[PDB]
Structure formats: structure tokens, C-alpha cells
């Protein structure tokens, strides 16, 4: 009952009705309280804050950041760069409502491990002066630790300069884990992605944080934050011959007891670009990155295909279960199936209209309303004055239309869900491709970017399930198992193996360009099998615990 | 503009009317909107949160903290200890509505300066394997720095390690400054720790607040206070005289740090010494909000694990103006003291009635506060109505606007009159007497306070000008003067200003300050004038 929590609760309670009655449209707000649609993070509407953004740390580290009197200076070393990343994630969280994301953590923090290594290199000569000025440009395969027992030369001290460097970076990453875990406010949902940087700095960063989320906080308590995602790329870390196969095995072993990190698939046929090369200094631009809230921002109709500096403005969830339940009553299956798609066409248009309306509201903004947000992070910054109505900056944005509850939808007209019938598994794929088609059509119409999303249901776990009992109730197999199932998942109350669930739920990921997950409830052998199933049936994102 | 600012503004706007019409009693809610009193931090009433506390870092450093899921192990080095102090300040800021202060800031990090020095004391024998099992207990005078040009023998490992810790204990204070300067009302006081491990925390913080933040820009936070004592740092022969001169020189261009005086009649104890490891408990410490917590009618005289629960300000100007009209001076002077007793009783009743709601609390409503940082902790279950702990708090009755009250019946403020100074040193001693009487009656601790006017500067002056009319020298010269200061619109020297504003400090046991507006010669002279009489707290800035 922390007082800061009460202040946040009061703010939310005094803001949400004002948002509903003063900042929305009648048509959309009619469905926002009719269990058809659910606007996410509604309490932050009057503030022109955006949901999530992938922070480009290059500008905030080469240059500084200014917010009020907070005049900072460019970073110098690892113990300042990691803390600056924490400060940026915290400060931006005060100017945004969703979760903060660091795409290619290794790519961002690679140079400030090399700089710290140089700083240490120019310190070991103070004991015994020597002209070692060639360690600024000495290639190193990786930064490893070992006992300093047995050596009779500068090798005893050349490796020691990394021995303290790896410990310094390890303590920095442990502080990063704790600092993102010491939730004392009325809570920051930071997510980091890594796995595709083939350098000594990147691999040291990726190895000294996976071994720190396995030790645990406190006396051995499993940490809750940050959410960690591993990027799997063919030719990089998947095959045994690949470069980062060992880190993939380490991630599997850590997930075997702490249920982290999650896994992301860059070999998906919808996560590819035409400018990715193994030698590109900035290849991380053309690579999809996600967060713990299952958010994807990759393509751009009016911009270069990238994820950096972009993000999501807002999104909302659609309760297809209500439509499916309302579709009952009629006898023939063809008529009910046809009527289900009619109820899905208008709601997609309503959601796209809501997203465009929030786009209208969020424009005519100020660069000084959210410091450090529309000044160094978003794509359009550095070109418009602190008050000159930033409008050439918000075009490169994305919008989401979410859905939840496929199992109870697949039991409303045929009687069996997609775990006991093959007819059901064919109807399930139809009600997602149509959503994708209508999303593309609405993006052509309203002149923006739209996508289809499988919401995590972390704040929608039971609201729709409980409130559906208004015009009906006690329906066997649907309104008898407490929470609604996940977006497109096989019900937990149905006994199933791993292979069958993987085959059933896989095809729904290419259609969902906003986000998705494959969830399995229980040695890294099991995690390896789950990742193999995820890769084989072209899935993408997957979690096991 | 900022979403975080807008959420806090909405929370304040939705919480203040609820406090006004539901929680507070009608007797003292009548005076809060009548421009007679102002309850500070009215917004954080419904949450059981005390105003300010001095942080006993020893318990949250020797043992960790388990606020929420954040299970933390004990600290090990200066970086970890300083970041943990910052985290503790930030966490308690989410559970208290006032300002966080570190009592004897140099006292609470010296052991982890020593331990950090021990970090490299074995990281330097790694290259040169040697049995150095004595530098853990090697006495040192100060942690000095100098160019490393010329040295041989067993000193490039046993003395450079002592010398390399300068840049480790340093930039830790800089991260502390910037972290407190980046969007927290943090206060640090130091000056009376004679060890090298304590003086290293004092030199590196004055130097870091002189360089400033950014590209040579003056910093705003944290507020820094220097504790001056006879036998420690005042006389030229004293131990920390050089650091006092350095603080004056830094204040000569950055207007920081402030100055606190332990050489006062009201800032003494009977168990203090020069060798007690815990002697800092008997040393008074303050914040930037002028808060004093030293006296305890049912407890030991201490300041460490205590703080203020609530306080409110009075408007003596309204009483003085309502006392006008009559001709004779004696009758109006008597009526002014008549109108001051009832409001003192009302304020004491308010400070007890707010104590009533802060009573019957639960230790789980604010972790790390009523489980680690307070007097009486470690004896109470997470929900079993902690009540044998909140009896060690303090309650404050504040006042401001002495110049306007010194021109309502006499006509000339204490700067331009000698009959006004005599009347000036009568309306505060009465408040002190009545505060002691109400502390005897209501069975709590009460004190008299001089507010910093950081949230009350014009809130009284505007309505005072709009209520009756335009009155020369009273409600026609923009902002009011400070608590008991010489008016700004008057050409006065420093000696006369000190002679006028000196006697009041012994009367106000809650807070007070001496303000001067512009080489460290001027600051040194201001501190000399502070020591010449009984001042306690003072600062000179332009
Ligand atoms: N804990 C912190 N919170 C917020 N900002 C911080 C923190 N620590 C450091 N900073 C920022 C703000 C300062 O303006 C900036 C100083 O730059 P920094 O990365 O420390 O190296 P530098 O270039 O100043 O090197 P040096 O001080 O060694 O010359 O760092
Ligand atoms: N940046 C931070 N923010 C919040 N808490 C932190 C931060 N850094 C460290 N902590 C806290 C939480 C950790 O459990 C605790 C451990 O601190 P520290 O003394 O460095 O570790 P330790 O006692 O485990 O020793 P070591 O890791 O060197 O073996 O400090
Ligand atoms: Mg550790
Ligand atoms: Mg610096």
C-alpha cells in the first residue's frame, strides 16, 4: 500500500472517465464499453505520449540529453554508459505509457566496452611504465575470464586488463538487472533484445547478463525484470557451426530454471530486408526487434524498413469471443460462419478509425512536452523547433488492432476447438487472413500504418470472460473454465502434447504483424525441442516455462 | 507538459479537495482557507506518509532491503553504497511527501570508502604477488591526490592503491550529484568527521559542485550544508578549517553550500565527545527546508532515526492587520498576543488530529520506512498497528511575515526602529512557551518553525492585498519578506542585519535561516557574523 501507488490509482481513476467522455469518438467509445474493443493504456490519452519506442542510444551517448536543468555530457566508459541507458529508460518511461525497449543491446553498448578497455589499458603502466600504445586497435575474439595463476610476462597483465574489464561489465550488468528490478515507484517494463552482434564487446555483454539472471536477486530469488529476448538468426547462432551457438545453449539452460530469456526468430520469411550483410557497420537497422508486450515495428510504407527510432502510437484489443457467441442460434454452419465475418469487418474499421483519431490528437504536439522523447529518439526529431507543431515526425508510426480468445470462438458454431478437430483448424486460419487484408485496406485508406496483434492479455485476463455473462451464461465449454484462453492458443483444459500444439498454433504468426507468442507449460533439452518446433513451423516468438 | 507532471498534477487536484472536505477536522479546516494557516503537503494526507526523515544508512547497508520483490544483498564498495543511498532516498521519496536528508553524510559512507580502498588493495597484488595483509589497518591522514611522477619500492602498489581510490570515490559523488539533479529534494550535511575516510567524502563533493553540471552550468541539487563546530572546523587551528574555506570559495560563485552552526546554546548535548563512534547521534542535522528534530520529551536526545510528521504555517500579518484601527499601542499589542494563542492551540490540535490518522497504520503501507528506517522498528509485524513508534515524531507550527507585522501598530520595521526589535523579540518567545505547554497537554512534541517560503511566497500576499485594500509598506510591495528578516527594500549593511536577525534563532526550535545578497572574504565575514551571535543556520547567495 505504498503512497505512490495510491497517487497513481487516483490519477488513473480521475483520468479514465475524462478520456472516455472528452477525448474519444462516440462510435469507438460505444464499443470500448460493450466488450467488443478494449483501448490499452487509456489513462494516458490526454498526455500526447506514445506507447513504445526503440531508443537510439548513439545520439544520447555521443551527444548529451537535456531535460529542464538536467544538462548532461557525453558518456565516457561502461559504468557511465550502462547507467545512462538506465537513466534514459527511466526518464522516457516518465514521458510514455508503455514499455521501453533496447534493440540490439549488444550493438548499442559495444563501443563503450572498448572505450573502457582503452581506459584500463592506459592505467596498468602506472605501476611500471611501458610503451604499450598498440592496444587501442588490437583485435580480440572475446572477453573471457580465467584464473591468473601461471604466467611469466605481460600476458599475465595483458589479459588482466580484460579480467577487470569483464568484472566491471559484469557488475554493471548486475546493477542493470537490479536497477530494473528494484520497483519502488507507484514500475518500469524495460525489455532488451540481443543475439546478433558478432564482436567481442557484444558477446561479453550477452554472456555477463545471461549468467546474472541465472544467479538471481537476493539470496537466490528469481528476478522479474528486465524481460530478455534472444534473437535467433540462421548463419549466426542457430546451427551448431554458427558463431553464437554457445550463447543459445546458455539461454536454453537459463530458461530451464528461471523461465527467461524468451526466443525470437529472424528466420521467418516476414522478418527479412534487402540490406543485411555480415559486414555492415549498422546492419542492426534492418532487423525486427520485439519487447515483453509482443510489439513489432518493422516495415514502413513511406519510410525505410527499420525498427530503430520508430514505435507504436496506440493499440486496442478485439474480443472475437463475443462475436462467436452471438453467432450461435442458427442451425446451418455456413450461414453462421458467413455472419461471423460480417461482425469482424465493421469492428476492424472502428479500430482503424480510433487509431487514426488518436493520431489526429497526438499531432499538433510540442517537442518540449516530452523532453528527450521528441528531441533525440524519434525519427523526425532534430528538424523542428521546440514548439513548432511537430507534424513531419509522426508519419513514421504504426498502429495495432489486437485480438484474443480463439478457442472459445472455435467452439461456437462447430462445437470442437482446434485440438480435437481438423475442420476447426481450417476455420481458424480464415479469421486472421481476413483481418490482415482489411488492415492493409484501411492502411491504404487512412494513409497510415496498421497491423494485427495478439495481445499478451496481461491487463485483459478476465475482464471480458467475466463481463460476457450479461445476455447469456453457463455455456458448457466456454463460460465454465474461468479465464479465456490466449489469442490463438490450444486450451489449457485440453490435454495435448507439444508437437500437436506447435503444429496447430504455428500458421497464425505470419498473419499477425503486430505480435504473437507460442506458450508451453512444463535440462535444456525441453527448451531445445520447443525452439526446434518454433523454427520448423515458421513461428517467430516463443516462450516456455 | 510532461505526462509524469500531468499525472502528479491530476493526483494533487483530485486529492486536495478530498482532504479538505473529508479527512481533516472542521476546526482546523476553517483556518486553512481563511489565510491564517497553510498546511504543507496537503495532498499526501490520505496516504499514511510522514513528512521527512533522516536515513540511518547503517541498517540498510549492513543488511539489505526487501521492499517488494527487490531483495538486495548488503553493499560492498563505494559505488554500490552510494547507489544504494540514492536508491534509498528515491524509494523513501515515494513513501514520504517531504525531503530526504542524510544525517552526517560523511559519517555514513566512510566505512564503504575504506572497504572500496580495500577493493583495490588486493586487486593490485594480482600482477605482483605479495603478502600485503596490513593495509586494511594502516592509518592515513587524508586521501590525497598528486601527479604520479617518481616513486620506487613497496609504494607503487601499497601507496598508488591508496592514491588510485581518489578517482573511484570521486565521480561517485558526481553520479550522486547528477542523479539528484536529473528529473528529489535531497539534502546532505557534513563537516564533523575527522577521519580521512570522511574528509574524502567532503572534499570531492565541494569540488564537484563548483565545476557544475553540463558545460559549466550551475547545478541545482543536491542541497549541501556545512556543520561548523568549535573544536572541529571553525578556528584556523581546527582540523577542517581548509574545507570550510573551500566551501566559502565555492559559495562565492555557485551559491552553495549553506552553513550550519553547532556552536549554539540550543544545539548541545551531554553525551557528545570526540572519540565516540556514534557521537553523530547527538549532533544536530538539518535539511534545505529548515527542519530541526533534536528534542524528545519521552526519548533520548537524537536526530538519526526520526523526523517531522507534519507542520503548518501561520500568517502573523493577518493578525497584525486585523489589530490595526485602534489608536493606542499597548491595547493593540495585547490584542495581537490574544489572537496568537488561539491559533497556536488550533495548530497543536491539527498536529494531533493528523497524528490520529497517521496512528493505527500498517508497516506494509511503506516498506523500508517502518521496517528499517525509524525508531522502534524490528519489533512490529507487517500489519499489527505500529503505534509505539510514531510517538517519537515532531510537530511544527510555522510563521512568516515579520516585517508587515512590525509595521501595523508601530509603523517602522526592526531595520529602521529600535522599539520594533523589542516588540520583535516578544511574539516568538510566547509561541515557544505555548508550544511547550501544548506539548505537555496533547502529549506530543511541538516546535516553532520559520518556513522557507518555497511554496508559500505569494499565496498570502495576494489575498492580503485583495482582502482589505492597498496599504503602504504592507500589501503594496509585491512579495512578503521572509519569516523574520530585514525587508529587501532597505539599504542595510551586514552587521546591522545580523544584529537584528540574530536573537530569533534561539526562539525558533524548528527552523531558521539568515539570508545575505551580494573572493570568499564576503562569505567568511558572513560566517563570522553568524558565529558572533546565536544564529544556527545561515547562507549568503545572490
Ligand atoms: N547517476 C547518474 N544519473 C544521471 N546522469 C548521470 C549519472 N552518472 C552520470 N551521469 C551523466 C550526467 C553528467 O553530465 C555526465 C558526465 O559524463 P560521464 O559519462 O560521467 O563522463 P565525462 O565525459 O564527464 O568524464 P570525466 O568526468 O571522467 O571527465 O554523466
Ligand atoms: N544500480 C542499482 N540499483 C539498485 N540496486 C542496486 C544497484 N546496484 C546494486 N544494487 C543492489 C542490489 C544487489 O542485490 C546489491 C548487491 O550489491 P553489491 O555490494 O555490489 O553486491 P554483492 O554484495 O553481491 O557483491 P559482489 O557482487 O561483488 O560479490 O546491490
Ligand atoms: Mg553480485
Ligand atoms: Mg566528470
Numbering used by the authors:
A (entry chain B): 120 to 305, 310 to 645, 652 to 674
B (entry chain A): 120 to 302, 311 to 645, 652 to 675
Provide the authors' original text about this structure.
RNRs produce all four deoxyribonucleotides and are the only enzymes providing de novo building blocks for DNA replication and repair in all free-living organisms. Class III RNRs, which only function anaerobically, are dimers of an α subunit (NrdD) with a stable radical close to the active site, and binding sites for allosteric nucleotides. Binding of ATP activates RNR, and binding of dATP inhibits it. Here, we present structural, biochemical, and biophysical studies on the ATP-cone-containing NrdD from the human pathogen Prevotella copri, showing that the binding of dATP causes increased flexibility of the C-terminal glycyl radical-bearing domain, as well as a flap-like loop that binds across the top of the active site in the active form.
To investigate whether substrate had any allosteric effect on the conformations of the ATP-cone, flap, and GRD, we determined separate cryo-EM structures of tetrameric and dimeric PcNrdD, from the same grid, in the presence of 0.5 mM dATP and 0.5 mM CTP, achieving a resolution of 2.6 Å from 1,105,348 particles before post-processing for the tetramer and 2.6 Å from 1,132,695 particles for the dimer. Both forms were almost identical to those seen in the presence of dATP alone, and no CTP could be seen bound to the active site. In both forms, the C-terminal GRD is highly mobile in all monomers such that it cannot be seen in the cryo-EM reconstructions. Furthermore, the GRD is mobile in all complexes with dATP in the a-site, whether dimeric or tetrameric. Since both the ATP-cone and the GRD are disordered in the dATP-bound dimers, the exact molecular mechanism by which dATP induces disorder of the GRD remains somewhat elusive.
